Structure formats: C-alpha cells, structure tokens
C-alpha cells in the first residue's frame, strides 16, 4: 500500500489489518512511554482549505509516534492566488517530508497529487481515515463488526461520511442497517441499489420511534444549518431527529457522531454511558497512528 | 413583473420589452443630464458572497436613475455566523429598501427570499440580468436577435452564463448555434436535448478553424485556472482556444466575453473593431437601469 | 438638544417630543414621495467596532430624509493601530460632516467625543436610539406608554438594552413591570432599588406561566450563546424561555424583541398577529429620521 | 486640464486658477445650502491600496457638489489576484463613472491608466491634490504665497509630501525656505541642487531654536515610527523636533501638518491660534471640490 | 496540584515549592544539554484570544523539557462561530494532549474547563504563571521575598498583573509596599482594605520623587495607550511616570516590568545594571518549565 | 562566523566551506536515519512579513538535524501595531532560542538586529541562503563552479536573487556570463561596471537564440506579473523568454529557477533531464542544514 486516497481502494482485508495495527498503537499509548517508531520522520499537512480538527488529529498521531510535523495551510496568497500549481507544491513538499496528508476542494486533486508525489499521500477529503476511525470505534466498543444492528439518523442524502460507512460496512457479514431520516433526505437511490445487489437487509424508517431497543449502534450524521436555506426546514429536521436524554436512557446502543456537534445531540446526553462520540474522537489518534506507520514502512 | 429570479420565468415578450426599455435608458444616459426617474428610491445590495463587479453595476445603474443605495455584503459574522437567517434579514431589509438585488450560494435562496420579501427581488446568482445584458448587446450591435449565427467558445460544461444564454436564444427564430470546445467540456447533454426538442440547428465542433465568416457572434466563455487542478489541462485549453489577433482580423463577427478576461483574449485584439467585450460591459448599465425601473413601477 | 449620548440626559418631555416627531416622519414615509428635509446634509458613521445592523438603520434613515452619508468603520490600521486618536478623528470628521453617529468600546468615548466635536454626536453604544425605538413601538402598537403591563423575559442581568428601557419606562405613570428570568439572570439589584425608590410596582417571576393574559407587552431580550461558556446553562435558559406558538395563541400581548433573533422565538410564531418584532424593526427608520432632523435643526 | 497626474504638469497659472476656484467653493460651503454643480455626476474611487483618509476627502467633496460616488478598493481577490489588469478595470470603471480618483503602488500606473481612460483621472498617489491643498492653506491663512518665510521640520529625507511642496513653492517669487531636521534626515541632495539652480535662498539648520520669529509658516512633516527600526533613533528625532506649547506661544507663524499627527505636535498646542493643521484638513474639501469640478467641465 | 487556575488556590507553600523547582530547571538550562524530563508528552495551547507572547513562552518551556506541542488559536470560525462549545473542545483536546494552557475571555471559562478536562489545565488568563514568574525574579535577584521594600508605579487601577502580585506578596513577612500612581489610577479600594486587614504597611504616594533609595524593587506596570481615550490623559501619566536614566543612576533598586514596554521605560535605561526586565523575561522559561513538570507528575 | 546577514560578508572560502558541509548533510539525509546533530537546539523564525516558502525550508532543515522550532510571524498587532520594537523582540527571542532566522522589510533591520541579539542571526531578506543554495546546485550538478558558461534569462533589472548570484560568481575563475533579456530589463549599469572591473567576460544578448549549446547553466529568473502594470509588457516578455520543451531538448545545459514558477517554464519541460529546478528546491534543505549547524557550533 502506497496511498490512502479512497475507501474503494481498500478491501475487507486491509481494513482488518489497519484496525488490528490500530489496536497495537492504542496499547502502546497506554504504556505512557515515549514511542519512537517514526523517530526520524516528517509529516507534512497540506491543507488548501483550513481544518484545525483534522490538522490536530494527524499532528498528534505523528508526534505520538515520535515524528515531526511541518504545516502549510493556504489556497490563498500562498500559491493559488500567486500562480503555483498543486503539482509544483506537491513536488516541493514531496522533497521535504516523508509523508503527506492532503486536503483539497477539487474532485481529483488527491489522485492527481499522488501521481507527482514521491511520497505517500493521505487524502483528508471521500474521507478514508474517518471511515476507518468509525469501524475501529464500533469494533472497540461493540466487540465485533459482523452481525450488528446499526441505525443512521439525519441527513443521509448529503451526508459525506455516511455513504462511505454504509459502503464499508456492506463488506461484512450480516449487518442490519436502519436508515432513519426525513423523506427529502433519504439515502441516495444508487446506494440503495448496491445494498440490494450485495443482498443486505435494510429498512427506511421515518421516525426515531420506529426503532426498537435491539439496535447496537446509533450513528447520528451532521445536520448543517447552512445546507438548509429555509429555516423552517432546519427547525423541522432538528426537532424531529435531535437525540435527547429521555430517548437514550436504558437503551443498548452506543451513540456515534463525527464531530462537531451543534444541535444533533443535547448536552445532557454526554454523561450517559452510551454516548461515545467523544471516545470515538479519541480513537482517531490510534488509527491515524496506524495508518501513518503502515504507509511509511510499506515504503 | 414582481421578481427577476430566473430566465425561465421570462418569455420572448418580456425580453423584448426589457430590451426596448433598456434602449430608452441608454438614450437618456447620452442626454448627460441628471435623471430622476427613481429619485426617492433605495436599492439594497444583499450579497452573501462578495462581488464588486456585480455590486458596482447595479449601484451605478440605480444612481444614474437618481436613486440611492444601501449595501450589505456578508455571510460571515454579520448574520449566518451569529444565527440570523436569510428570511429574517430579507424581512428587515425588505422594510428598509424599495428593491433588493440578492446574491446567495444556496440553490433556492432567491426563490425562498421572494416569498418573504415585501419588495421586488433581483437574483444576481442562474444570472438573468447577465443574459439580458448579453441579448441587449447582440441586438444593439448586430441589429437583431432573430436569425443570427453565434458561436460559443470555451468551457461550455461549467459555463454558468453560457447555459442561460443558449436557453434565452432558443426562444428566437432561426438562430444557428456553433458549440466549439474540447471534448471534456462539451455542452451538457440535457441542454443539447432541449435544443433538438425546440428544433434548433446547432453544431458541435472541436476546433476554432471549422468556422469562417458565416458567424455573427463569437461568444468566449471564462476559462478559470482554478477549475483545472492539472495545469497541463488548463495550458492545453487556453492554448487551443485563446482568441488571437491573427484569427480575428477581417472577420464578420463581434467578440463577446463577460469580464474579467485573463487569458481568453490577447490584449492586441482590443483595438480591432470586432472586439466588443468592453462595450458589452457598458451596456450592463442601461439594461440594469431598465430592470430596476421596470420592477419598481410594476409594483 | 445638541447631543444624544445617554438616556439619562433626556426627560419624559424630550422623549415625547421625539416620539411625536417620529410619528410625522412615519407618515411622511407612507407618502412614498421624495423627502428633502435634510437635502444638503451629510451624516458620518464612525464605528470603531463594526455593526452592519446599526450602520444600515441610520444610513437608511438619513437617505430617506434626502441626505448623504460617508462611512468610516475601523479601530484597526485606520487610526488606532497607526496612532491617530479618537479626538483628532472626531475633529476631522467634524469638519466634513453635519452630524456623527459614533460607536466606540471605551466607556466615556462618546462624552469625550462630543467635547471636541463641532457637530452633533449620536451615541450608538447605553444605546438611546434603541430605547426610543422601543418606546415608539409600544406607543404605536398599544396606544399609550402610561399604565401598561409589560413583561421582560430572558437575560435581565447582562441584558443591555433592557436596563435602558426599564429606566426610561420608570419615568411614566402606572407602569407595571414583570421580570421573568432564571434566578442567575435576575435584574441587577441597584436597578431594583431605583424602582422601589421611584415607587414602581414590579414582580420577579421565574416561569412564563406565572404570567396571565392581562399583560399588554411581552419584551423578549436577546439570549446570546456566547455569554454562556457552559452549554448546559444556555440550553436550560433557551428551553425554559423560548417563545413558542402554543404559548402565544389567543393572548392579548404583542411580542417585542430587538433583532437579531436566534433561538429566543420560534419561526412559527412569526405569522401570529401579536408578533411585532419585524414591525418594530421598521419603526427604527422613522424614529431615527426624527432624531437626525431634531439634532440638526437644534443646531 | 484633462488629468491631474503630477505637479510637474501644472504651472504657476493652473495652480492659481485652482486656488481661486477653491476659494469660491469654500464660500459656497458657508452658504450651508444644497449645492448641485455636479448633480448628475458619479465619482469612482479606485484604490489598489486602502486609504480611508483619502477616500473620505474626495467622497465628501463630491457629495458636497451634489454628485454621487461608487467605491472599489482592492488589489486583492478583486482583480489582481484573479487576473484582471489595471487597464481592463480602468476601461470598465471608465464606462461607469464620470471621473476617477486612482491610488496605485506601481510607478507609472496613473500615467498608463490615463491613456486607456475615457474619463479624467486624479492621481491620489506624487500627490498633487495634497500639494495644492497645502498652497491653498498658506495663501488662505498668510494672504499670499510669494515672498514668505517657511520652515520645514522633521523627516525631510523620506518625507513624501514635503518634496512636492518644496518644488511647488520654488515656482513663486522670493520664498525663503528653512530646512530644520536631523543630519540623517536632511533634504535629498538633488533637490537642494534644483533650489540653488532656481536661485532660491534656503538654510539647513539642525535645531528648532536656530529659527527666528521672522517665519510665516512652520510646516511639520510626519514622523512615522515605522521608518525607524532603531527606537533610539526615533526617540532622538521626536524629542528634538516635537512642537511644544512653550515654543509656539507668541510666535507669528501658523503651524501646518498633514494629518495624522501622532507625536509630532503636543495636544496642548491645539488651542493656540497659530495651530492650523485641523483648519488645513478642512481646506481639503474646498480645493478637492475645485479640482473635481475643474476636471469635469474641462471635458 | 492538578490545575493552576488562580493564585488564590496556591498557598505560600506551593509558591516556594514551584520557585524552588524553577531554580533547578534554570540550572538544567545552563547545562546546555538535551533535557528529556517530559520526552513523551504533548502540551496543547488553546487560545480563544491570540497571544504570541504567551504561546511562545510555554511552547519554548515545553520543548526545553523535551516535550512536543500542538497549537489551536481561534474563537473564530474554528468552533465558536460554527457552534462547537468550549466544553466539547476541551473534551477533545483533553484526549489528544497531556496538559493544556487555556486562554479564554469569559470569566469562569478556565474553572469550567477544568471540570470537563481529564488533563491539567493552566490558566493563561488572573494570570498565575506571570505572578510566579514575578516572585521568582525577585527572589532570584534580591535573594529573598520576605522583608523587601517594593514600589509599584503606573496604572494600579486597571493593572491586571499588579493586583495578582500585591496579593501574592501579602502572604510573606514584612513586605513594605509603595503605591506610586496618579490619583485617578490608585489601587482598588477593596485591595487596600485586605492589605490593612492582613496588617501590611503600605504607602500611597503621588510622585516618583517621594520614593527613597531604600527601595529594593521598582515594579513598573504597563501603561497602555488604548486604555486612555483622551490623549492628554495618556500624555500626562507617561510624562510623569516614565522611568528615565537620570532617575535610575546610582539607585539600589532593580527595575521590573512585564513586557512589552512601549513608553514606560526609556531605552537608555536598558544598559544600567538595575534594569532587569529582559532578565525577568528569561526567567519565565524556567518557572514555566517547573509548572509544566509539576502539574504533569502530580498526575 | 557568527551571523549570516550579507553575501558581501562571505569570501570564496566560507562559500566553499559551507558548500562542502552541505555535501555532508545531503549524504546524511540519504542515510534515512534519525540525525541528532542539533538535538537540543531551538530555531526561532521571526518573520515580519509572512513567507511560508522560507519558513518551511528552515523549519524542515532544523528538524532534520533533530532540533526544534518556535515560530512568530507578525508585524501586525503582535508588536509593531502595539509598540514593541524590533530590538525588544530580538532581545526576548534571543533569550528563548539558540539561533534566529529573521525576515524584515526595513533596510538595515538584520544588521541592527544582530547587534542586540545574543544568538546567531540568519537574514532571510539580500538573501544569502538563496545564493549559497544556487552555488551548491551548480557545483552539485555541474561538478565545478570555476570555469562554467552560465546564461541568465529574464528580468535582470529587478531580478533580486540574480544580482546576488552574478556577484558571488564573479569571485570564481573563468566564468562566462550571458545576460539574455529585453532591453528594458537589462542588468543594472553599476553591476556591469563591477564585472568589467573584475575583468569578467560577459555578453548582453536579446534573444534566446543568440545563445549556443556550449552553455552549462541556464538560469531563469522569476517574471512576476505584478511588476508590470501594462499587461502588454508582461506578455511581450513572457512570450519571448518562456522556456519551452522544443528549445530545451538535446541541449547540454541544466535549467535553474528559484521557485515558484508561474509562466517562466512550460510544464512539459519538467520531464526533461536538464530540468533541475525541483532538484534545486530539494538542495535547499542540505545547505540550510549546513548553515544552521555551522552558525551554531561557531558560537
């Protein structure tokens, strides 16, 4: 493996290898002793669109392995405004660092970049590293990925991360999926087709109540106010799909949600044992530590 | 007419009415005398995405009619970052001004806005005012819109303005359209269908050479370097479709191009008589003067 | 009157005079005819802290009277970063404009400014113009200021505008005030003192239900999420004091709220007849028109 | 003329004509009545480098004559970052406005602009308008320009405006010039040569004391802290050339200084009758009113 | 000790413990050899209000101990503008780093943060680390903290750091305090009360002359021009309290001043042996090294 | 060697010593093993004018040697806007770091800085480090610096780096220089004089054709669009001096060009063996590693 550009470039095997490696990394973290696996390496963060959340994750992961980091975050008067192209920049940074995490708006910028890069590229957005992080959390908390009952709540139409996860989970055995959302935000039709094709049992419900306390994972998508020009549409969705304390109490599921959370989950839900979004956030360090080490040694 | 949101809400009649009124406005400008048609009116520029080019046009047009203007340009910590919704803002500005030019990213923001606005809304981006401006230039310079041979060169795929013009022109009699562009940037298929449906003769050529003297209008689209992550791709397109002096000399056509022009047209083309992009720019004032007056009196 | 710096510089008489003049201004606006009361005058907007909301109001008001406006909005590299002091700036603008609306952070900046200004200063924040605007709305919609039953809901502790209004209303006869809020956000003690001293009957309730349908005006303060570091605190307040449709239906009161409104009032409340916040927003133009004219002629 | 690009394009004649017209404008301002000399005209402010001080002056002047203004201030992502050249912009604005005030960094941008502009260009920086403003102040306050004893204090080496004034004053009869400054900041040698050539009597003194009460005008240059990397150097200069009250009292001269003033003049000097810097600031409106009218009618 | 939020949470004991540890750290720095005390640790700088001065100090201290650092500095579109609360951020960073330096505007943000943080929080503003730094300088240079004669010059009213130091010093034996300042900037009354209560001998003088050569430490506060809207007020204070060379020569005291220094101390004072502000700046690294190590091991 | 401020402070000796040490560093990089030469050192990046390009180079170099870095990049509200002078900042950072890379606009800021710095200063702009980087590339690729035939193409007039290299190369034996450029951009006269004085054979050609294949190095300068207000001038230069593939094929020279490259070199040239600009970019790390180590040990 030499690049991590898309989840569709990784099979059920790589996924399990990475997850296994991630488990080791996690154990190493508890050691609470100075790790030096990547002692002499340099990770370069090339973001054409700022993202502190992302930068921090990778920077922390790399530093935990004993490596160093150099950042560069600007599509502004740093190169694109001037005239320096993505290719030239990638060739220059490619010569400075040992691995690169790229964040670019253009569709095939990451694929294109990996062509001119003489170093491994990690696409930070299709966000592979987020999907792996999701699978690691499920396995870590539920004990297994195969044969689980997971529900997706929220914007399944425009949900970036959601589609990537629905696809990755479709590679495992007996996974029941429940798609809860408004009618206007139902899962894309071509994805529903691929699920039927792969012969996966799923349901499309409209209310959070239609679910039953038999679900293992409740995955809440991000509901971004900006995607809804009409405020009534937003107050309609948020009000009908917000996860409240009353609804969570005594249930068997764990709550998952890729940060940030604005109105998708009440704050009084944070203390319940089934609230795992913050634990999930943490798991991001171990799996990114795994992905960094994996890509460096493989080269 | 109470709103100007989309070209598809205007028929061949309003189009001719507007163009006719634009003609009068232009004459009035030559008068070089203080106009006061909208003496006591206030135009509000509500841009959620900055655009000096647009703001200036409308602001100049309104002031030429003797009116006043109040500007507001921020999706940032002016309302969206805070929490004020498009609707509340539209209701407040609706109470301050007599007419509003709106520029928002969201798809149906303009339509939605016009529902809560107690004042005419002009959608500045579908860019109606730009298409009208285009039609007024053709008529003004060629003498007629019906039965003309127009060629569109450049990015016909992501071209915003181009699609709007191809549609508007399809409402006139015997207009021959020549679509010159790379294979990767050919006109969207569903637009080609509607042209066949409307029974309009068009051609899809690949080189600027398959054109000679029959053509009345050469419309050059904007080729934005930012749309092409791979510099070789942009270098290719620009090199094969740039309008040079040699190619323009002695031809019958007039050159049109919505500013700004970066590499689409050589500067030595600017003195040729067929170069009309700067005159086109000017025409924007008269037609916007017409649209403003039209929408205000109609209410 | 030569300056409008503080509400405590205005007595029950000026207040009624201004409100009276504001009424005329409103009538004049309906005329829908070009006003020219301040035809040759220039208003300068000197904001050391940006505020589109404020700038727009005064700029619209001034332009409705037929005057012109010059803006200047920066405490940044416009003077303070360089070294130009508030006094020098005020003396320069004082020479350019006929009246000035100032917005500065420093406590006595406005008072100090008026000392060096050879032109009327209007303090835009103590926000006088907002309080007058509030009183004009009440009188305009309820018919009288004296003898009304008004309730204040929300943050009465940090509430800015609220204190200014409670004081202004204390100058009128038989005004019953109901202070509804959480215990942590009760009205400042020294203000409660002054109310008892002035012999004014008021109540400090904790729930929106303790309120009967005998209230004439329901004034909802702004609940800013930024004032609450602990999200649970903000969630509690908003959830217990948000104005919902169910609670407003069939009641005699009119709802008042200085924009912007984020979570203080549900959108489905906007169609009820008792929702007046957008009307209130409009009233701001007439009263500012009055304040501008008043201060200019008085000098 | 048709353009105001450089002082060296104006002879002692135009200078006196402008100054005479500026006097009329000033009288007209006192009228305190709505002027409409340029009632139907539009002034465009094209600044590639922000300058509120400049923008405000011209905008106020234009509005006092009854004209309108459209602003555009960005060398950033408004055109230069994108790709739109100064020429294209000048050709577009040239079609919108009736006159243009340009502010560009490049050496010959203004001259070049005037070639492509179909409308008068006023160069706001060589700053012509500031020098005229200076001469108008001297004549207005001293009664005559010919035969005066003027002293220049401060940074005569990097002082911008100063050189422009020394040159303009060298066109008049019997002007004695006293150049007071540190040795490191003496007037450029080639300027001293041109003064000897024109046979003008001048002196280069080092202390403010060497000057006698026989001086009609004391011109204090701007001492900007940023031009001095070594704080001691800056400290030296300011301490030895700051204008204090004690030094000004009872003297015959008037104090002149192009704002802003940071440390060049103590605040306690502002009350003395010989302090004219704020009066000078005001005079800027009349002379700019003259320059705008002059350039518009002349075309 | 698990958090350093306020000086009032630390007794004369911890203060001496920290100071002692700081001494060791200093010695270790002179070793000029790679320290690895915190070799595998990560410090997170969470600033909601930018402050390079602060960030640099802690970042340098942490790196001197052999640790790593991850920065995050934005209250802007990084979380607060979006919607992510201080708590969620603290819970996420709490999972990435081993210790956190927090800088927030809200009053109890630090206290609140420490409740949800699973890692030690260091409040960088009440600024503890600056006060300790101050006490370490005094002890380091004077030899003892107990029984010293210290004078505070400048803004004792708005002086942030000053109050924190007057309180800390009140925990030691026989400390004579001299409060030199204008009448308008006298030490807050409630602080003077607590001093009388603790039975501490102090004096409130108005001139720098009232001080005798018996004083051991002359502590000059920061005089920020922005706190004084009236320039005369600022000119007044600076002129009467600036520390000049003449006044310092031959005196027994050492001069202290928390950088930056603008006009509080002349540059020609920097060479005198009693000028210690730059030495003090240095001491900040050792004591912060101590505070970081102390808080990490204690957990 | 204690400071690297100007190339004119370095003789043919140090140049060769640095280049030799740079060679070692490069070899050490290939080792691909953790270097720890500067294990316990801290490099401080003090940029008063942002420059990611520069910051990245030095930060990477320092980290490759096993050192740490602290950054500070602001002339804005970090010190200059406030009041902190370059000297105070240099004295403070001087106490934090072990070496400093300074980037300041003022002419003698670096020289002045080194006076107050108790640590080595590296001037990053006169850009020494870029010239050395240039010489290292030539020696590394051509085998020798003495007796080479180098041609300079482009803007020799405003070309900054170019002058620095022409001078440095004039210290070696038998270097033939060919200066290819438009007439308006010829090499500064005083530089041509010094070349004649040093008795160096050079030629001033106008076309890229006038050059022969005997040339060992083709150095292409940066052609910045911003330096040319007239767009026609820019295209005349770019069109006549851009390096195309056709012109490079089969020739013996290597192409050099300090990044970024916008229009100076076609992308299809990047694959040719003689294209060394990206290789040159890389060489920047080794030589900066040398310069850092050299300056630290020498002190």
Contact call for residues F61 and F292 (beta carbons, < 8 A): yes
Rounded to 5 degrees, what are φ and ψ at C122? -115, 115
How far is the C-alpha of A12 from the C-alpha of A2, rounded, in Å? Answer: 17
How far is the C-alpha of A151 from the C-alpha of A205, rounded, in Å? Answer: 10
**Does one domain contain both D206 and D166?**
yes
Q: After which residues is chain E broken (C to N over 2.5 A)?
A: 125
Tell me the residue range of the domain where E96 lies.
1-126+284-299
Q: Which DSSP helix (H) or strand (E) runs through D178?
A: strand D176-180
Contact call for residues A100 and A122 (beta carbons, < 8 A): yes
Chain F partners (3+ C-beta pairs within 8 A)? A, B, C, D, E
SS (H, E, C) E265-280: ECHHHCCCCCECHHHH
Which experimental approach was used here?
X-ray
How far is the C-alpha of D18 from the C-alpha of D7, rounded, in Å? Answer: 12
Handedness of CA A187, A190, A194, A197 (dihedral sign): positive
How far is the C-alpha of D215 from the C-alpha of D176, rounded, in Å? Answer: 9
Chain B partners (3+ C-beta pairs within 8 A)? A, C, D, E, F
Contact call for residues F258 and F161 (beta carbons, < 8 A): yes
State whether residue E13 is helix, strand or coil. helix
Contact call for residues C126 and C5 (beta carbons, < 8 A): yes
Q: What is the dihedral of CA A52, E79, E292, F55, to 10 degrees?
A: 30
How many CB atoms are located within 10 Å of the residue D215 CB? 17
Measured CA to CA in angstroms, residue C195 lies from C127, C171, C190 at distances of 20, 10, 9
Q: Quick one: closest CA in B to A88, which residue?
A: B231
State whether residue C144 is helix, strand or coil. coil
Nearest to A99 by CA among A3, A20, A1, A5: A3
Integer-rounded Cα Rg, in Å, for chain D is: 20
Contact call for residues A254 and A274 (beta carbons, < 8 A): yes
CA angle in degrees (0–180, nearest 5) for D51-D56-D59: 125
Query: Which is it for strands C42-47 and B217-220: parallel, antiparallel or unpaired?
Result: unpaired
Per 3-state DSSP, chain D is made up of helix, strand and coil in percentages (nearest 5) of 45, 15, 40
Measured CA to CA in angstroms, residue B260 lies from A59, B105, B270, C13 at distances of 40, 20, 14, 58
Each residue of F223-236: b (16+ CB within 10 Å) or e? Answer: bbbebbbbbebbbe
State whether residue A177 is helix, strand or coil. strand
Q: What DSSP state is assigned to residue E47?
A: E
Task: Say yes or no: B259 contacts chain E, CB-CB below 8 A.
Answer: no
How far is the C-alpha of A233 from the C-alpha of A227, rounded, in Å? Answer: 10
**Does one domain contain both B118 and B136?**
no
Concatenating the DSSP letter of every residue in D84-153 gives --HHHHHHHHHHH-SEEEEE-SSTTHHHHHHHH-SS-EEE----HHHHHHHHHHHHHHHS-SSS-EEEEE
Q: Return the half-sphere exposure (C-beta side, CA atoms, 13 A cut-off) of residue D189.
A: 1
First to last CA, chain D: 8
Integer-rounded Cα Rg, in Å, for chain A is: 20
Beta-strand ranges (E) seen in B120-234 are 121-123, 149-153, 176-180, 202-205, 217-220
**Does one domain contain both D187 and D266?**
yes
Q: What is the dihedral of CA B256, B261, B266, B267, to 10 degrees?
A: 100
| CATH code of residue F112 | 3.40.50.1370
Residues of E in contact with A267 (CB under 8 A): 85, 87
> CB D266 to CB E235 under 8 A?
yes
Residue with the two structure tokens 């696409």 = A123
Task: Say yes or no: B104 contacts chain A, CB-CB below 8 A.
Answer: yes
Interface test with B, best of F235, F243, F269 (most B CBs within 10 A): F235
Q: After which residues is chain A broken (C to N over 2.5 A)?
A: 125
**Which residues are CB-neighbours of C163 under 8 A, at least 6 positions away?**
C187, C188, C191
CA D161 to chain centre: 6
CA angle in degrees (0–180, nearest 5) for E121-E127-E133: 100
**Does one domain contain both E147 and E273?**
yes
Task: Say yes or no: B267 contacts chain F, CB-CB below 8 A.
Answer: yes
**Does one domain contain both C251 and C161?**
yes
Contact call for residues D205 and D180 (beta carbons, < 8 A): yes
Contact call for residues A166 and A187 (beta carbons, < 8 A): yes
How far is the C-alpha of A16 from the C-alpha of A135, rounded, in Å? Answer: 9
Per 3-state DSSP, chain B is made up of helix, strand and coil in percentages (nearest 5) of 45, 15, 40
Nearest to A291 by CA among A41, A2, A34: A2
Measured CA to CA in angstroms, residue C92 lies from C292, D163, D279 at distances of 20, 25, 9
> CB C95 to CB D63 under 8 A?
no
Residue with the two structure tokens 């009218």 = D293
Per 3-state DSSP, chain F is made up of helix, strand and coil in percentages (nearest 5) of 45, 15, 40
CB nearest to E232's CB, from D232, D235, D267: D267
Q: What DSSP state is assigned to residue C177?
A: E
Rounded to 5 degrees, what are φ and ψ at A218? -110, 105
F253, with CB counted inside 10 A (0-12, 13-18, 19+), is: buried
Is the preceding omega at residue B260 within 30 degrees of 0, hence cis? yes
Number of A to D CB contacts under 8 A, please give it. 3
Residues of D in contact with B56 (CB under 8 A): 70, 72, 93, 96
D33, with CB counted inside 10 A (0-12, 13-18, 19+), is: exposed
Handedness of CA F151, F155, F160, F163 (dihedral sign): positive
Handedness of CA E191, E194, E200, E203 (dihedral sign): positive
Query: Which is it for strands E68-72 and D217-220: parallel, antiparallel or unpaired?
Result: unpaired
Nearest to B280 by CA among B135, B137, B142, B124: B137
Interface test with B, best of D96, D97, D119, D297 (most B CBs within 10 A): D96
Measured in angstroms, the resolution is: 2.8
CA angle in degrees (0–180, nearest 5) for B9-B14-B16: 135
Contact call for residues D152 and D177 (beta carbons, < 8 A): yes
**Which residues are CB-neighbours of F67 under 8 A, at least 6 positions away?**
F38, F39, F40, F41, F42, F43, F98, F292
Residue B71 assigned to a binding site: no
Residue E103 assigned to a binding site: yes
Task: Say yes or no: D52 contacts chain C, CB-CB below 8 A.
Answer: yes
State whether residue F282 is helix, strand or coil. helix
Task: Say yes or no: D77 contacts chain A, CB-CB below 8 A.
Answer: yes
**Which residues are CB-neighbours of B192 under 8 A, at least 6 positions away?**
B202, B204
CB nearest to F95's CB, from E33, E52, E282: E282
CB nearest to E231's CB, from C85, C104, C109: C85
Residue B82 assigned to a binding site: yes
**Alpha helices (H) along chain C:** 12-30, 52-64, 86-96, 109-116, 128-142, 160-169, 189-197, 231-241, 245-248, 277-297
Angle between helices A86-96 and F52-64 (to 10 degrees): 20
**Does one domain contain both F139 and F179?**
yes
How far is the C-alpha of D79 from the C-alpha of E76, rounded, in Å? Answer: 27
By residue count, chain E amounts to 299
Number of domains in chain E: 2
**Which residues are CB-neighbours of E200 under 8 A, at least 6 positions away?**
E170, E175, E177
How far is the C-alpha of E200 from the C-alpha of E189, rounded, in Å? Answer: 15
> CB A85 to CB B231 under 8 A?
yes
Residues of B in contact with E77 (CB under 8 A): 81
**Does one domain contain both D90 and D134?**
no
Concatenating the DSSP letter of every residue in B227-293 gives G-SSHHHHHHHHHHH-B-HHHHTT-S-EEE-PSP-SSSB-GGGTTSTTB-HHHHHHHHHHHHHHHHH
**Does one domain contain both A198 and A51?**
no
Q: What DSSP state is assigned to residue D198?
A: T
Take residue F93 and report the two structure tokens written for it: 């950072």
How many CB atoms are located within 10 Å of the residue D253 CB? 20
**Which residues are CB-neighbours of C35 under 8 A, at least 6 positions away?**
B40, C28, C29, C64, C65, C66
Residue with the two structure tokens 């000098």 = C299
**Does one domain contain both F90 and F191?**
no
**Which residues are CB-neighbours of B47 under 8 A, at least 6 positions away?**
B54, B55, B71, B72, B73, B74, B102, B103, B124
How far is the C-alpha of C159 from the C-alpha of D30, rounded, in Å? Answer: 45
Take residue C118 and report the two structure tokens written for it: 């050879």
How far is the C-alpha of B173 from the C-alpha of B177, rounded, in Å? Answer: 12
Strand partners, D178: D151, D203
Q: Which DSSP helix (H) or strand (E) runs through C205?
A: strand C202-205
Take residue E107 and report the two structure tokens written for it: 């009053």
Task: Say yes or no: E259 contacts chain F, CB-CB below 8 A.
Answer: yes
**Alpha helices (H) along E170-230:** 189-197
Take residue B14 and report the two structure tokens written for it: 């309003």
Measured CA to CA in angstroms, residue D286 lies from C109, D264, D292, E233, F233 at distances of 30, 26, 10, 34, 39
**Does one domain contain both A119 and A139?**
no
**Which residues are CB-neighbours of B250 under 8 A, at least 6 positions away?**
none
Nearest to B284 by CA among B29, B12, B13: B29
**Does one domain contain both D100 and D174?**
no
Query: Which is it for strands D99-103 and D121-123: parallel, antiparallel or unpaired?
Result: parallel
Each residue of C240-273: b (16+ CB within 10 Å) or e? Answer: ebbbeeeebeebebbbbbbbbbbbbbbbebbebe
How far is the C-alpha of C136 from the C-alpha of C133, rounded, in Å? Answer: 5
Task: Provide the edge-to-edge strand list for the sheet that holds B217-220.
Answer: B202-205, B176-180, B149-153, B217-220, B254-256
Nearest to F265 by CA among F216, F208, F192: F208
Take residue B275 and report the two structure tokens written for it: 């170069």
Nearest to E25 by CA among E258, E295, E292, E297: E292
Residues of F in contact with B266 (CB under 8 A): 235
Take residue F163 and report the two structure tokens written for it: 């002058």
CB nearest to B52's CB, from D68, D78, D95: D78
How far is the C-alpha of C31 from the C-alpha of E279, rounded, in Å? Answer: 73
> CB D230 to CB F87 under 8 A?
yes
**Does one domain contain both A154 and A252?**
yes
Integer-rounded Cα Rg, in Å, for chain E is: 20
Task: Provide the edge-to-edge strand list for the sheet that holds B42-47.
Answer: B68-72, B42-47, B99-103, B121-123
Contact call for residues D127 and D194 (beta carbons, < 8 A): no
Interface test with E, best of A28, A52, A137 (most E CBs within 10 A): A52
Chain B segment 19-48 residues within 8 A of E by beta carbon are none
Is the preceding omega at residue D243 within 30 degrees of 0, hence cis? no
State whether residue A71 is helix, strand or coil. strand
Nearest to B255 by CA among B228, B285, B230, B279: B279
Interface test with A, best of B230, B232, B233, B263 (most A CBs within 10 A): B230
How far is the C-alpha of A44 from the C-alpha of A68, rounded, in Å? Answer: 9
Nearest to E226 by CA among A18, B220, C75: C75
Strand partners, A203: A178
Task: Say yes or no: B288 contacts chain D, CB-CB below 8 A.
Answer: no
How far is the C-alpha of B64 from the C-alpha of B39, rounded, in Å? Answer: 10
Residues of D in contact with C95 (CB under 8 A): 278, 281-282, 285
How far is the C-alpha of D147 from the C-alpha of D132, rounded, in Å? Answer: 18
Interface test with C, best of B48, B59, B83 (most C CBs within 10 A): B83
Nearest to A58 by CA among A89, A19, A103: A103
Handedness of CA C269, C272, C276, C278 (dihedral sign): positive
CA A74 to chain centre: 23
Contact call for residues D177 and D200 (beta carbons, < 8 A): yes
Q: How far is A81 from chain D (nearest CA, A)?
A: 5
> CB C229 to CB E80 under 8 A?
no
Contact call for residues B219 and B256 (beta carbons, < 8 A): yes
Q: What DSSP state is assigned to residue B105?
A: S
């Amino acid at each position: 493996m030499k690049h991590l550009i898309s989840m569709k470039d990784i099979g059920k095997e790589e996924i399990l290898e990475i997850l296994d490696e991630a488990r080791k990394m996690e154990e190493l973290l508890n050691t609470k002793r100075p790790l030096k696996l990547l002692e002499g390496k340099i990770l370069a963060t090339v973001f054409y669109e700022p993202s502190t959340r992302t930068r921090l994750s990778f920077e922390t992961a790399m530093k935990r392995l004993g490596g160093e980091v150099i950042t560069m975050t600007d599509l502004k008067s740093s190169s694109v405004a001037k005239g320096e192209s993505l290719i030239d920049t990638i060739r220059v940074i490619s010569g400075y660092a040992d691995i690169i995490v790229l964040r670019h708006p253009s569709e095939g910028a990451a694929r294109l970049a990996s062509e001119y890069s003489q170093v491994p590229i990690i696409n930070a957005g299709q966000h592979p590293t987020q999907t792996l992080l999701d699978l690691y959390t499920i396995m870590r908390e539920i004990g297994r990925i195969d044969g689980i009952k997971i529900a997706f709540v929220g914007d399944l139409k425009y949900g970036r991360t959601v589609h990537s996860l629905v696809y990755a989970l479709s590679l495992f055995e007996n996974v029941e999926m429940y798609f809860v959302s408004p009618k206007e935000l139902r899962l894309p039709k071509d994805i529903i087709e691929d699920l039927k094709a792969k012969n996966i049992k799923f349901y499309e419900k409209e209310s959070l109540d239609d679910l039953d306390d038999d679900i293992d994972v409740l995955y809440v998508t991000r509901i971004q106010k900006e995607r809804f020009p009409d405020p009534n549409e937003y107050e309609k969705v948020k009000g009908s799909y917000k996860i409240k304390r009353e609804y969570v109490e005594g249930k068997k599921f764990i709550i998952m949600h890729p940060l940030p959370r604005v109105d998708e989950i009440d704050y009084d839900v944070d203390d319940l044992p089934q609230a795992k979004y913050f634990k999930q956030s943490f798991y991001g360090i171990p799996v990114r530590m795994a992905i960094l080490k994996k890509l460096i040694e493989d080269n």
